[PDB]
Amino acid sequence: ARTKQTARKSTGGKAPRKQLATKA
Amino acid sequence: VYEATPFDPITVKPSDKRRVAYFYDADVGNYAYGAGHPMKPHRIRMAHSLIMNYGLYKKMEIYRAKPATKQEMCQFHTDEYIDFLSRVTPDNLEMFKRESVKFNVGDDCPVFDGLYEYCSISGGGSMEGAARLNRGKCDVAVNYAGGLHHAKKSEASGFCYLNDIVLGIIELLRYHPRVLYIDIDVHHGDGVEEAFYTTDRVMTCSFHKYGEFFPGTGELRDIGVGAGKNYAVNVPLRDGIDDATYRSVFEPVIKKIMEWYQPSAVVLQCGGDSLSGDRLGCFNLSMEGHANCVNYVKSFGIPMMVVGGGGYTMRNVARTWCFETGLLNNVVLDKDLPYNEYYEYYGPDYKLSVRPSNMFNVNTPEYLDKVMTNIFANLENTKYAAEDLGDVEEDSAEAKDTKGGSQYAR
Amino acid sequence: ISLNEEVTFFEKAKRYIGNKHLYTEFLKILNLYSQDILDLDDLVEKVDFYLGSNKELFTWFKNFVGYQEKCEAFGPSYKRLPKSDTFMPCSGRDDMCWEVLNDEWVGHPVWASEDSGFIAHRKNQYEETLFKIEEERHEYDFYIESNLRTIQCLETIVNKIENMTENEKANFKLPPGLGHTSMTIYKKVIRKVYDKERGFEIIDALHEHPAVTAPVVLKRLKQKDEEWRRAQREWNKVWRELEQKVFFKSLDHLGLTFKQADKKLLTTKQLISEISSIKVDQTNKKIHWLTPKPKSQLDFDFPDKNIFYDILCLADTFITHTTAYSNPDKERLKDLLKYFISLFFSISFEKIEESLYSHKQNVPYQQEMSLLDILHRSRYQKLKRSNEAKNPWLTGNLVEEANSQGIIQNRSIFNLFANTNIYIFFRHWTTIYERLLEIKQMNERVTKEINTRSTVTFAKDLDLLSSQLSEMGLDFVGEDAYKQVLRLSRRLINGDLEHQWFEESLRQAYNNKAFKLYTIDKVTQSLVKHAHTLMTDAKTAEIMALFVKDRNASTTSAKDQIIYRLQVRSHMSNTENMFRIEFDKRTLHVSIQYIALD
Amino acid sequence: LEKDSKGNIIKLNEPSTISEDSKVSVTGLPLNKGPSEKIKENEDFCSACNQSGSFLCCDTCPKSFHFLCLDPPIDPNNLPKGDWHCNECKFKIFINNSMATLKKIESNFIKQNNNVKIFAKLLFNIDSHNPKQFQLPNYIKETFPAVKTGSRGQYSDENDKIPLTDRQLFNTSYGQSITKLDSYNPDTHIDSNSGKFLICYKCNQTRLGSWSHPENSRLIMTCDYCQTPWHLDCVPRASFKNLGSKWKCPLHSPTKVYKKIHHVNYKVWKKQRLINKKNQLYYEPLQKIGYQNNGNIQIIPTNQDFKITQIDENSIKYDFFDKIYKSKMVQKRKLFQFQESLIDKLGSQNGNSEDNM
Amino acid sequence: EDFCSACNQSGSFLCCDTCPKSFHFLCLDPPIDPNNLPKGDWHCNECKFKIFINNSMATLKKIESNFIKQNNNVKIFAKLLFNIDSHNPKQFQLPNYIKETFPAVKTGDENSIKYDFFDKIYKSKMVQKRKLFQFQESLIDKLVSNGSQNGNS
Amino acid sequence: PKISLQIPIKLKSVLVDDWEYVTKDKKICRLPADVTVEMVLNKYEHEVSQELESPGSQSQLSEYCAGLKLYFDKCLGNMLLYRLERLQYDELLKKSSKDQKPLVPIRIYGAIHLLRLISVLPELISSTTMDLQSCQLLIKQTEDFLVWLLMHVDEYFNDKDPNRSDDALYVNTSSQYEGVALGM
Amino acid sequence: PKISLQIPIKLKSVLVDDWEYVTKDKKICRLPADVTVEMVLNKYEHEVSQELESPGSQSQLSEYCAGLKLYFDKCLGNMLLYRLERLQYDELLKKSSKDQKPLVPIRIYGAIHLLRLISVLPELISSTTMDLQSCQLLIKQTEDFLVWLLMHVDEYFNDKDPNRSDDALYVNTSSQYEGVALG
Ligand SMILES: [Ca+2]
Ligand SMILES: [Zn+2]
């Protein structure tokens, strides 16, 4: 089978994690 | 109960002559998080480079703590988490996808090469610092390599993978019935507060910036549950706190805690983030207003351990950690840097000072009185009353280290 | 009777709560208690937010319900986990660790943030340059130092081989970590230099066959060390000067946004909104706290005289330099400020003229020119050519002076009745005084600090300390700070000094404390412009026509002030809201009252 | 690298050191130093969740699934070998190429299980659809006006603050930050539409300070329901809370009450959700005093069991006073009984009450 | 019909045109002596109710809801007073339940609101006082043969 | 369901026996009666007032009490009277008309007619639309009301000094009067 | 066409709360509940069997209870689980195989999950091809069940705070369980 991927590895989405991948 | 008072020059107390023990593992400087990551373990090396040139090694005792084993790391963290840390490397990230989401590792806290080794340097560094205090060998332990207060039982948050402070405190708890933890990092010390929330044997007094600032916990009403009710103490400060206002809050609260809940030991986490100019923290503390926090806690006379914690601007945190190391050794350092390998950093006047900014101080005396009133209302309830244990092996590092740091270049 | 209050408690409560939408919630809360849903203590705590201020009422309510003064305090951050999830094992937890540590209660950012994320603290345009530089510093420093730690590790190894016999050399494999303390460091350095993947069979060759591998790897690692250092030195100059151009701006959070925030918040509108805001507070509470209605909503204080000669010489420079005002009229602008100041603040005019004269030196007859003469153009040329009834006192509060029966004979106290364009001209005068004075108060501490700062010997032998300002002369090494700040400002209006160089000089001299003196060129301009309105706008000039006569009057009866007030009111439109600026000669205290009477 | 292990090693490889390091090339000097020098086919959304993640893709049709969603869940570590199909495609393949008319296949299923016959078709059909994420049917969510589906399928209420535009958070000039009004904005202390000042409720003041002295200014925010301005000091409050959820001002009735029974340890009361306008029934009871509202009320100026009782204001005065007076009588009784009780436990009283006067 | 619904027996009738039911003159809510008769219609109370509201439910609910709000003085007796006008008069009939128990049968402003609030509070006070007082005189009577206070305060 | 109201057992006899007299003996009460509806009911508002301590309990007492004075007025001409009584009631309206003063049933009739209303009461709530909670209270004073009645049931329901005909509530009437009461 | 199912408001207010706890509060129900789909229907089938006399309806009742159980087993995997609960469902399957007993959802899941199936019954009915007389047969029968569920709503759906009781139907989710389920 072919599985694409996940682009980003966190459940928070980095909105609540500092030095965000997705929040600056 | 908040009395605004102008700042006073830091004065050394001749009554206390504590014999310090400094924990520096020479490797801890050689680990780097990422291409643009704020946490830079370089800051330990410069903060150590400055220390050796003031000749502070003449007063301190230089130690190299044996790195923490895989089992001893597990007395706080679950076996699944530690096992993930040992194998994980940048090449192995594809193999671990369920874990990397379950364990918040590798996205904001990156999986850099040497992830396990660096964490192993932090813990043996704080754990043994507690072990030496218990034996009575040293009245102070200084472990700037460690201090990572954001990690959790099975999660890596806030750049912190291994929560050494919990490992450090559990080592003190085997001899001292009560331990006090004091946080001066601008972020809330949720890693230690959530670990000791239930027990009364540890009080976690934390100063931080509330108002949807990471981790967005530590509200004033969080005072622990179960037995550890009122045995947690959060002081939610607002933006732009400065030298004179911070002292008018830090000193009255700490003086209350050490009266009502008499600690046998203190774990003071000297966060660098609170200083002015840091990239992630928003306070206006200068060095003299920040190092005064250490000098106050030291003056009480009970054994303490100083851990480095978080600092995100290498120039500022390396200067204040060297000054704080001066105060513990009963010497106020001169405001003139000595020649050191990392000399071009400390621009532009090349003096040992962190200059407070111009930003507007917003904490208001009417607000600070309401925060300090509620805390004092609560604190009147807290009246007093291959395994290695007591890891003690220390290694006597200075013979090897004297040629490092001390420079006669020209 | 005690019954009287209770039958009126809801009426007394209704009046204080005010709007109905808040009163309804007060009824709903009172309902929940009567439905046995809400406990008594919780009811009193909620009523506190309603009736907290009315202590005489709240105390009665606490008495009525029977409240007696002198776990469920969970907190918002932490949530309980189920019992099953706490079983995930820990290998090295002693029995003691189980009692102390916390396993049931947990709190996470994604819950405390309410899933909506966080706000990071904003940073400057320049403070983000010191962060780019910091990373460029670390990137060069990380690779070089991590390289050195391998050099010493291999150097001790290599000397061992040349001691050993060639046959011995055949079998001297190195355990991982090369015997060093760190197993990981020596891999991340070799892998970088030797082409990624190719690098892996180097390490295996380094372990399996070091005698022929270690000498070669050490050679290249030293060679890569020399290249890396030669770059840093070249990169050191780029980083040092860039940090010099943008450091003192990074600290200056308020200075950068000051120039735009000054013209936004120093206007005819906000200066009236600010003073009115204090008047409503004293009357609002009157509605609720019952504060009496007082005089002098706004209070100023003038401790130091020599600032006035300092502001005048500043506005003297701008007036002469300005191209907008026509040359014959500029003589009135100069002569307005000296006379108005010499009149309002009791300073003798001749003393002012010497102060301007000396400032002219630094770079033929005087008949009595009244301020009254200045305010009318027609009379000005002559001194240029030469060398209401049945009106009782009812307000009382408006005219502060009720000191003496009949006529007060000698009173320091003097009040100026003003339009909007008089008060604004006066708020533009205090605004400079507040900004200048706080500099002169620091002047004794700062002057000593600037002189005593010393170059570090290790930064003077090498060429490191910035010399840009010393060449330009904008470092307060040779003079007292405050007198130097003026003769820098005098150059700003003159246009000799660029704005960004004037500002940077006060950043290093005052550590960013004196940021307010970034618009001393514009505030001086706006003050002159408002002062120009006084000569023109013949309605406004007629107001200070009356003021000069009143200020010259030593003996003013209580009714005389009312006579003075009513005449001034005649000249304003019935819509405009006149101000009262009050002066106390003995204590140099100026108190402004906001008036919107009949 | 390669090497006669006895002989010398052939040099591994000439280091292709073009690193494009944050500085331009680690070995390269700074370039031109102009500034800084003073002098010179398958879908990307899971068919079940409708969101992103690691997917396991159907081979026949362009439908992707999460690893958790597909029934039964499939481990990311261990997967079925070879090609994979969604349960829908497996059905079509199943049906096709064998006993192809569905009818006959289905006609056997209904005849197979005659007891469940009423559910026969529904059981047979469920074998054909792909796994799905449960979403409440619209006729339920439409009953309550307040509730609305969020961007992710979340439950979003009237309490959740409408999200800030991503531009407003990250695109502001330095001097003014919208997210935090921690830079002396004086236009906070003004009511935009009316032009009067906002007055705090606790201290009945507005503290707009001079531009000369901004430390006299105290921050003010307004409720999200009440619109009654409060200082950030009066309600002790650290910050403005403009991200997470609407800030409920103090002074607004409780929507959830935990009552300790004082003898389960506690009882819970939750206000009835607001029903759609037509399905709501407002009732004014014939009994003025003592009607059990259960906490749901509309204040009159002067199967639907979800009925909001309408209560006159004068009724609440009688109810609240009625509750108070009854408790006072009970409290006086117990205290008087206990003092009389010690007399009950009591030849000669010797209470000395005659001496007392 | 032949019998009178309110006499429960056959009677000479005054008849409402709309409703076939007719009643005997004696049982007239307003006595209506045969000698003096209304003009033609003689609408019964039940019929008079329908034409008054015009057989409209919305007004009926409204005129009801107005009637309750009007009689805030006596609210509990609101629906009962509202209904009694519509129903036609009926002879008093001893209800079955009271009969069934027995074995045998033979025959087969603003200030006003404050005042209305004040007096009830005031009336409540003495009741509270006199009950508290009577417990106190039970305390003195607990001391046998004489009051402990020996007098009244 | 159906509203359950409990009459005291002696009061049940009072009404049932009383119905026997009117149908058979054809006796009619002397009107205005010895014990008016008012002072019987107004007095209830007085004693029970000094017993209830709550503010609301004082309001509900006057509420239900004042309403009963109002309800009896409209509900007299409709239901409470008998065939024989209705003939006697008709006169009153003429008698009130001859004075032109309005006829007020409450002040004139006796308490036994009030007892008749309470017996018919639980059927009357059945026709109304009141919810259960409101109906409970209407009943709760009603039951507590009749609990009072037993204390003074001897005074005015029961014949005190029964020898005199005036003490007897109902007094015998002429047969030709009864013929008019028939209406045929 | 379009089938209408009258869910009583109280049951319609429960579900919404269930939609709030699982998507916003991020708490899931303790899976091995006390009142599972099996005994809920066991009681209802037993309470109503004695109530109705005609043997014809007893057949109609018993199959609707027997049928709803069999349908629930097939349905729970596909469309009766929110995304956050998928992992908890998976661990039950993963526990079942080790315990060597096949999972039977009616034995595990609670009454609220039965109500989820009832909510989407009209949508499932409309998709298929059924006799009209059977559509009113299910809907009328279900409307009779929901009425019975209303009379017993108190002791199936109780509002207890998970932090407090620990007997509450819902239990919170660890930061690690939430991470895998959502991530
Ligand atoms: Ca604690
Ligand atoms: Zn921090």
From TrEMBL, chain A:
Superkingdom assignment: Eukaryota
Localization per record: Chromosome; Nucleus
Organism annotation: Xenopus laevis
Whole sequence portion shown: 2 to 25 of 136
Oligomeric and partner information: The nucleosome is a histone octamer containing two molecules each of H2A, H2B, H3 and H4 assembled in one H3-H4 heterotetramer and two H2A-H2B heterodimers. The octamer wraps approximately 147 bp of DNA.
Name of the gene: LOC121398065
Protein name stated in the entry: Histone H3
Phosphothreonine modification, residue list: T3
Protein family membership: Belongs to the histone H3 family.
